[PDB]
Amino acid sequence: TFTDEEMMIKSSVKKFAQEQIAPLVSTMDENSKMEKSVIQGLFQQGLMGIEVDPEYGGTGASFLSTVLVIEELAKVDASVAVFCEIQNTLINTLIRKHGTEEQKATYLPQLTTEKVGSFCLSEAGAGSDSFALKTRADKEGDYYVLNGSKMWISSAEHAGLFLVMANVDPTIGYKGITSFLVDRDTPGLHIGKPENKLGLRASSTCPLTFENVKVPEANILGQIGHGYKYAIGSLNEGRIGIAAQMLGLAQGCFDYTIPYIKERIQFGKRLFDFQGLQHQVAHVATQLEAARLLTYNAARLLEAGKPFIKEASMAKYYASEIAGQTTSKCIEWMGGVGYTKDYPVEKYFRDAKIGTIYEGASNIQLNTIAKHIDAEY
Amino acid sequence: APLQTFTDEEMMIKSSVKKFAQEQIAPLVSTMDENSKMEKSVIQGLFQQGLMGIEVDPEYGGTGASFLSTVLVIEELAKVDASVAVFCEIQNTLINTLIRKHGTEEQKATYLPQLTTEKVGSFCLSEAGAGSDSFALKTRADKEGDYYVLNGSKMWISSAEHAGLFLVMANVDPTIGYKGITSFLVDRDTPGLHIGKPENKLGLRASSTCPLTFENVKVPEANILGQIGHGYKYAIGSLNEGRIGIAAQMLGLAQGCFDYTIPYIKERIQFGKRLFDFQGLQHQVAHVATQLEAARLLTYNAARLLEAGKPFIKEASMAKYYASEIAGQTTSKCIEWMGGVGYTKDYPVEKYFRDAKIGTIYEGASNIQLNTIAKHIDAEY
Amino acid sequence: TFTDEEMMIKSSVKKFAQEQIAPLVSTMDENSKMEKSVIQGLFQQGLMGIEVDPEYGGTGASFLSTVLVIEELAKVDASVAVFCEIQNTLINTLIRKHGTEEQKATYLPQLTTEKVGSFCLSEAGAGSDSFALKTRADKEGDYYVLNGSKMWISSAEHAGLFLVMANVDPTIGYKGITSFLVDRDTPGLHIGKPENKLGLRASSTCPLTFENVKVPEANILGQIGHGYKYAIGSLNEGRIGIAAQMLGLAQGCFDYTIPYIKERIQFGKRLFDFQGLQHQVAHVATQLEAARLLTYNAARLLEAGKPFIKEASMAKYYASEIAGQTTSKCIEWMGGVGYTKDYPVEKYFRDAKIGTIYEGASNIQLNTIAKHIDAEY
Amino acid sequence: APLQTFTDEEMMIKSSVKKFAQEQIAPLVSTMDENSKMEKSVIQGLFQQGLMGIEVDPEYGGTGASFLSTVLVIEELAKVDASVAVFCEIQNTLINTLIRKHGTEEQKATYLPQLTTEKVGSFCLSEAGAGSDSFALKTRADKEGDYYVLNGSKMWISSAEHAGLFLVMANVDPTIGYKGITSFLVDRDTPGLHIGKPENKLGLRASSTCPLTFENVKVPEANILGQIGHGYKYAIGSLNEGRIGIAAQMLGLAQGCFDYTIPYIKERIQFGKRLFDFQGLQHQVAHVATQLEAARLLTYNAARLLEAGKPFIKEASMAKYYASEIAGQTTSKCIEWMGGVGYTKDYPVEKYFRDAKIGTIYEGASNIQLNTIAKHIDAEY
Ligand SMILES: Cc1cc2nc3c(=O)[nH]c(=O)nc-3n(C[C@H](O)[C@H](O)[C@H](O)COP(=O)(O)OP(=O)(O)OC[C@H]3O[C@@H](n4cnc5c(N)ncnc54)[C@H](O)[C@@H]3O)c2cc1C
Ligand SMILES: Cc1cc2nc3c(=O)[nH]c(=O)nc-3n(C[C@H](O)[C@H](O)[C@H](O)COP(=O)(O)OP(=O)(O)OC[C@H]3O[C@@H](n4cnc5c(N)ncnc54)[C@H](O)[C@@H]3O)c2cc1C
Ligand SMILES: Cc1cc2nc3c(=O)[nH]c(=O)nc-3n(C[C@H](O)[C@H](O)[C@H](O)COP(=O)(O)OP(=O)(O)OC[C@H]3O[C@@H](n4cnc5c(N)ncnc54)[C@H](O)[C@@H]3O)c2cc1C
Ligand SMILES: Cc1cc2nc3c(=O)[nH]c(=O)nc-3n(C[C@H](O)[C@H](O)[C@H](O)COP(=O)(O)OP(=O)(O)OC[C@H]3O[C@@H](n4cnc5c(N)ncnc54)[C@H](O)[C@@H]3O)c2cc1C
Ligand SMILES: CC(C)(COP(=O)(O)OP(=O)(O)OC[C@H]1O[C@@H](n2cnc3c(N)ncnc32)[C@H](O)[C@@H]1OP(=O)(O)O)[C@@H](O)C(=O)NCCC(=O)NCCSS
Ligand SMILES: CC(C)(COP(=O)(O)OP(=O)(O)OC[C@H]1O[C@@H](n2cnc3c(N)ncnc32)[C@H](O)[C@@H]1OP(=O)(O)O)[C@@H](O)C(=O)NCCC(=O)NCCSS
Ligand SMILES: CC(C)(COP(=O)(O)OP(=O)(O)OC[C@H]1O[C@@H](n2cnc3c(N)ncnc32)[C@H](O)[C@@H]1OP(=O)(O)O)[C@@H](O)C(=O)NCCC(=O)NCCSS
Ligand SMILES: CC(C)(COP(=O)(O)OP(=O)(O)OC[C@H]1O[C@@H](n2cnc3c(N)ncnc32)[C@H](O)[C@@H]1OP(=O)(O)O)[C@@H](O)C(=O)NCCC(=O)NCCSS
Ligand SMILES: [Cl-]
Ligand SMILES: [Cl-]
Ligand SMILES: [Cl-]
Ligand SMILES: [Cl-]
Ligand SMILES: [Cl-]
Ligand SMILES: [Cl-]
Ligand SMILES: [Cl-]
Ligand SMILES: [Cl-]
Ligand SMILES: [Cl-]
Ligand SMILES: [Cl-]
Missing domain, CATH: 1.20.140.10 (Butyryl-CoA Dehydrogenase, subunit A, domain 3)
Incomplete structure (x- = not known):
């Protein structure tokens, strides 16, 4: 028993999925490539900022709306569903909850309209044991130097924003882990080839390497x-x-x-x-x-x-x-x-x-x- | 709201039953199981606590609560003793509901006050040759004047040892199959109705489970429940x-x-x-x-x-x-x-x-x- | 495909089980009591000394014969089967493998003819962790004093021999654990009332208490x-x-x-x-x-x-x-x-x-x- | 003896296939999967190692080994590549067995030497309308003098891309149902037999799986396998x-x-x-x-x-x-x-x-x- 808004959003996504996604599911899977038509369709339909405030171009809807959108997308293509899930539930929520007014004013308008974000936690040596991550962040005056690597990063292939977990003080373990907003176009950041996967093939999954990647101190997300x-x-x-x-x-x-x-x-x-x-x-x-x-x-x-x-x-x-x-x-x-x-x-x-x-x-x-x-x- | 969010009445009823089960049932669970015998104190308690007429209107002595309340009561009783829970479930969900839904106004006025206060009902469908295939039941009801004469048998009848009322499904016209099957309100002490000894069971041992036989049991035509x-x-x-x-x-x-x-x-x-x-x-x-x-x-x-x-x-x-x-x-x-x-x-x-x-x-x-x-x-x- | 002897033993056990055991299964279960007639029959049929040498009144059969016997008994009554399994696979085997020739000459003729054995490892504080058993054995010249308790001892109600695991030096931990042949009627050995069980009800399961139970040094089984x-x-x-x-x-x-x-x-x-x-x-x-x-x-x-x-x-x-x-x-x-x-x-x-x-x-x-x-x- | 205690010949054949599979198959498994294409070298190698006539008598160029040897060869191959294993399984357990057990001396003398050395066989039972219900197959064989004229289609035929011999189940009299079903030995180059495009599959991708159609495929009556x-x-x-x-x-x-x-x-x-x-x-x-x-x-x-x-x-x-x-x-x-x-x-x-x-x-x-x-x-x- 959903609200009127939840019912409307569900019906809208069902139509979009049938008309814009269903014809492309096979070819996207075969070639491990999500079509631009689908990606831009999600943004256009307001499905990349479901809970974000209208002031930043968001839809302003409930968390259950996001859930119903994910479910409805996945009935046609689970790859498109996770692409939507990452943006809304990981990227947008983190910036909504912990971002400064400055960071929200900067990133949320982009994230609701055309910029894709990637959530960067996991490493080759830190899968289930996430907090064993070895990517480190050294403070050098007005910026942080990031060094390490990430693995399995969803949506990285064409992401413009990377939300990166890195340890500012490995001597205190997980309590040194800090969140950074990193722009794609920066010296030392490399996004590798998308993995060749069993399934979820249209959802890019890429290795990242950080060679002395410099992040302004103002790009720390939260504390x-x-x-x-x-x-x-x-x-x-x-x-x-x-x-x-x-x-x-x-x-x-x-x-x-x-x-x-x-x-x-x-x-x-x-x-x-x-x-x-x-x-x-x-x-x-x-x-x-x-x-x-x-x-x-x-x-x-x-x-x-x-x-x-x-x-x-x-x-x-x-x-x-x-x-x-x-x-x-x-x-x-x-x-x-x-x-x-x-x-x-x-x-x-x-x-x-x-x-x-x-x-x-x-x-x-x-x-x-x-x-x-x-x-x- | 979440499925575990209850009305005030539902929450209060759940709480009362928890207390009643822990205080009045839990000390007897082992003995009742060992002896395959429900305690009179427990049966009396269920009635006294209002747990035998949960959804029945207060005009017939019931509590007038929701169906979800009945579900919560059964759950709560079953946390302590599944046998006591089924005793409650049969009364509320089968017997009282059948009469509330399909009874005449006279039948409701006559039976529901008793069912909420002291009288236990048994639901009598199954037979030796009609278990999963309920509608193959062979108990027949032959019209004689303004009565029906019931002949046959039932099997697996829960609460039969204590029941004052038997809701019996019998066929008035076996040649039309299931469409002859008719519900009858049969009183315990009707000549020709015999209640056999309770089954010796793996579990649910405190819930009596008995065979019945009907030998020319005379039931007034008014005692038909519904059509x-x-x-x-x-x-x-x-x-x-x-x-x-x-x-x-x-x-x-x-x-x-x-x-x-x-x-x-x-x-x-x-x-x-x-x-x-x-x-x-x-x-x-x-x-x-x-x-x-x-x-x-x-x-x-x-x-x-x-x-x-x-x-x-x-x-x-x-x-x-x-x-x-x-x-x-x-x-x-x-x-x-x-x-x-x-x-x-x-x-x-x-x-x-x-x-x-x-x-x-x-x-x-x-x-x-x-x-x-x-x-x-x-x-x- | 079995040997002629294995086929013959299986066939005779099937007959014995249907004629002597099947009629008693319900009552033995209801009463939580093994019938002496069934126990006597097991001994009489040679089923309590299956692999024991004919020297000692045994049947001299194969291990697979013991398996086939246990399976055939269990088809009628699992309780009777375990009684048989403990005698043959736990008690008889240990005495055959680790007994001195005098210990064999003493006990094996009894174990094949009339005497029931119980295997005594587990305790309240040592079930899965058997080797945390706290029953201790103190050497006092020509004998050992056993002190402690055991739990869940099968066949204890009828057993004339108890094969007991006790620790002679708990500082060494499990390497102090030693096995003793203990006769039923020794002072200090108390067999408690059988457990009231869900099933296997005809197989007695009793607690044992050892209050200064004295076992002659000759009765240590093995090293x-x-x-x-x-x-x-x-x-x-x-x-x-x-x-x-x-x-x-x-x-x-x-x-x-x-x-x-x-x-x-x-x-x-x-x-x-x-x-x-x-x-x-x-x-x-x-x-x-x-x-x-x-x-x-x-x-x-x-x-x-x-x-x-x-x-x-x-x-x-x-x-x-x-x-x-x-x-x-x-x-x-x-x-x-x-x-x-x-x-x-x-x-x-x-x-x-x-x-x-x-x-x-x-x-x-x-x-x-x-x-x-x-x-x- | 334990089920994993083999004969000396069975042990020797297992070891040989393990070596073959590791050296000749393992390096190619990913390419064959990616391309949906079995390599010629692997097929040639199966024949060369004697793995395509395991139970066939040496008088027809086979090994004359036990059925358990065939099982062990299949198990050992599938440990490396299940596609290669099924290729071997069909030849040995379906094609070679059918002809060994039900062939005339002449049919055995003609086909078995080919099948043990270079000719791949396909087993052709299933149709779009006859999967689990195999015997509902609609492919017909009509008698025309000393020949049978096959008409219909098959679906899901493994190894069809490479097969020189097709064992085709067709019904010579559809009015008697399954009792009309007859096995035919059909050469690849018989006019009217067409092998369609291989299926695009989830797995087993190196094993070709093709539809067949039969348009007035003329088979001599001698090519009936068995009765x-x-x-x-x-x-x-x-x-x-x-x-x-x-x-x-x-x-x-x-x-x-x-x-x-x-x-x-x-x-x-x-x-x-x-x-x-x-x-x-x-x-x-x-x-x-x-x-x-x-x-x-x-x-x-x-x-x-x-x-x-x-x-x-x-x-x-x-x-x-x-x-x-x-x-x-x-x-x-x-x-x-x-x-x-x-x-x-x-x-x-x-x-x-x-x-x-x-x-x-x-x-x-x-x-x-x-x-x-x-x-x-x-x-x-
Ligand atoms: C397609 C894909 C997309 C992904 N998307 C992202 C992304 O966008 N961003 C990101 O940061 N990460 C992402 N992940 C990473 C994902 O979260 C990890 O693969 C996952 O956390 C498991 O880590 P692992 O692969 O190192 O396996 P391991 O941690 O090595 O686990 C292997 C097995 O060990 C078991 N195991 C491990 N630890 C324990 C334990 N303590 N107790 C019991 N069992 C245990 C696991 O349950 C599992 O069965 C993605 C991964 C994939 C494959
Ligand atoms: C303790 C107890 C209390 C009971 N309480 C009452 C009561 O108060 N009043 C009353 O009228 N009845 C009562 N029942 C009867 C109970 O509902 C029946 O036991 C049950 O419906 C099954 O019937 P059956 O025992 O004849 O088994 P069968 O109908 O013989 O079923 C045996 C098995 O066959 C399977 N089976 C049967 N038909 C099909 C089918 N079409 N497709 C697939 N599988 C099938 C069943 O699923 C089951 O696994 C009680 C029974 C017991 C044991
Ligand atoms: C009828 C009966 C007859 C018996 N007969 C005899 C007998 O003749 N002689 C004798 O010496 N003993 C006998 N036993 C004892 C029996 O072997 C123990 O009950 C059993 O070994 C478990 O010990 P426990 O009851 O203390 O349970 P626990 O050791 O407390 O185990 C409880 C649960 O914890 C789990 N668990 C424990 N340790 C681990 C672990 N390391 N990893 C994962 N899970 C674990 C167990 O698997 C189990 O699911 C008998 C028991 C019964 C009930
Ligand atoms: C890769 C591949 C290779 C093959 N190799 C060959 C080959 O070489 N030669 C050849 O002739 N065929 C071959 N087969 C065909 C294969 O044997 C059939 O696909 C199989 O018998 C199932 O038939 P179907 O696909 O039409 O499914 P269906 O018969 O439509 O079955 C679909 C589902 O219905 C269920 N079902 C059907 N009937 C019943 C029933 N009576 N009771 C309960 N459930 C039922 C089935 O169990 C299954 O779950 C191959 C198939 C594949 C996919
Ligand atoms: C969360 C994680 C890494 C923690 O494991 P571990 O290092 O053993 O954690 P713990 O020792 O239990 O606790 C460490 C800290 O994490 C917190 N924590 C652990 N699990 C938590 C959870 N599910 N929710 C909130 N906090 C959690 C603890 O409270 C503790 O913080 P504080 O000291 O401030 O109280 C592990 O349980 C886990 O979930 N791993 C998989 C992570 C994952 O989902 N990765 C996928 C990325 S996208 S595919
Ligand atoms: C109900 C029963 C006997 C019907 O089986 P079956 O004879 O195959 O039923 P059908 O041939 O499908 O239909 C018979 C009639 O019952 C109706 N019916 C069947 N299942 C029904 C259901 N679950 N709810 C409502 N009506 C149902 C049919 O619609 C039909 O009535 P109409 O002609 O008015 O449409 C069977 O599905 C069943 O539930 N058996 C177990 C009964 C049971 O729970 N006994 C326990 C007693 S307390 S332990
Ligand atoms: C056997 C037992 C008690 C060992 O506990 P655990 O903590 O795993 O012991 P470990 O550290 O693995 O090893 C201790 C010793 O026992 C040996 N051992 C353990 N399991 C063994 C097995 N299954 N077979 C042979 N030896 C075994 C080890 O080899 C070691 O001996 P050494 O020091 O001579 O090499 C435990 O695994 C077990 O099986 N518990 C249940 C006991 C049982 O069956 N009780 C039923 C009684 S009748 S109902
Ligand atoms: C065999 C088949 C086709 C027919 O089932 P069904 O319609 O129930 O057949 P039935 O009515 O039981 O019997 C029909 C005939 O086949 C025989 N038969 C059925 N199953 C048999 C079996 N497993 N072994 C030997 N004979 C069998 C019957 O004995 C009968 O022949 P007779 O009149 O000479 O005695 C079905 O059970 C089956 O196995 N389907 C799957 C076929 C298959 O494996 N296809 C894969 C091809 S390669 S992927
Ligand atoms: Cl917002
Ligand atoms: Cl993507
Ligand atoms: Cl489940
Ligand atoms: Cl009412
Ligand atoms: Cl009762
Ligand atoms: Cl011996
Ligand atoms: Cl005993
Ligand atoms: Cl299993
Ligand atoms: Cl041959
Ligand atoms: Cl092929």
């Missing part, structure tokens, strides 16, 4: 040493976003597959009429239902200002795990055609597999959930 | 609601089991660590917690859909299937997390395990839930 | 400080025994249930003809087949003198887990009648649940398998 | 063995993936620990190891049952179902254990994952395997 707090704070909200992506992906796969099994006839009946298959369908539908409830409930808790971290982890864990199961089963229900790239279900399957890995792997979600359970008893 | 030949409709309609009620029971028992077990694994030490600090065990606990959360949301959402007058049958089936399946998994894992002590009757987790197993069988076995969900999915595409 | 090794060695073999018990229990439950679902009619069909149910049955059958192959292969690896520990753990883990799944499903396939004590499937379900707990709980089995996988690469 | 109208029996007979072959492929690919992943999780450090030392991950690994072990035993036992002339169809279905299902779970878990690198094509685990998914679909989808298993269980009680 020195609090960057670890901002990283995991934004990722707590990001887990709801990834729950929504995984949900939408799984739903889109399911929605496509049921009409097929209704129409396909073997042994004189609809595939849907074999009870073994009906039971698998019903089991999966129940899991999709549970996933949707967990995702929306986490979102509503966040909106209400209630504790939501355990619930966000629960949604991301469950939705990502059941998206793997849903997509795997849909290929089977389709049979042979499901194994071919002429049908969409094999892409949903390839895309879903990422969900149990990024924004905190499944084991990490369970660790977080257990910590919360320990504190409740 | 002749619509008994099948009324039975399954009430069971659609009862499925949310069984979801609530399964949820509550799984939660009670889990809540008991976590403090133990935090306290118990092996290899110098709390059991809770073994990551394998932690992951299992977190996975189970997630399933409990999903089961809760499914159950409450089904209840809210029902309250909003929205379609709820698929969702009720989803809640019952899911809650019952994860109640089995939850209780099975809790025994393991407890270790050896979990396998003994000196601890409560083995009873929760035995009790949970019924949830995938009664009020429509799991396969039947899946068949129902599939029918709705086919209609949606 | 001092090597008791930890004997304990876990016998338990490696015991794990194959419990796999066989769990296999038999699950197979007996399955074998009972299939005729019912073929005979029972709903909606004008045999229950067996509903495809959802068929698929569940076929899935369980596949797991039963896999559990059997794991159990027998582990047994053959032991007999061939090949490494078998990883394989024994895999068998016990898998067979116990699928015994729980099989019995849970069988109740569902039977419907209402499966939930009543008038039918046998609810007992199989209560009995199966102990399989993932005793003889090293599932998590411990997985830790062991992981240690071996670690060593293979 | 007219028994082609349904021959086809499903060969598929019962092929199910053990696919079990072996799924087993080998899962094992290869597993074997690659364990050293990685031993060496990768996070939070100061090897990934292998996180107990949650350890338990997942141990669980997967147990499943692999169980799949191996099911696979080898089914093979040994077949060799002993014992009933093996239920066991073959159990092996294929179980191995395919756990290959999916194994490869899915390996990607997770690897983390980010597992999701990239620079590492080999994502290909195992994509390849494994075909296992639950071809050679009789999982549901069909369960149906077959159930039919045998019914006969046993």
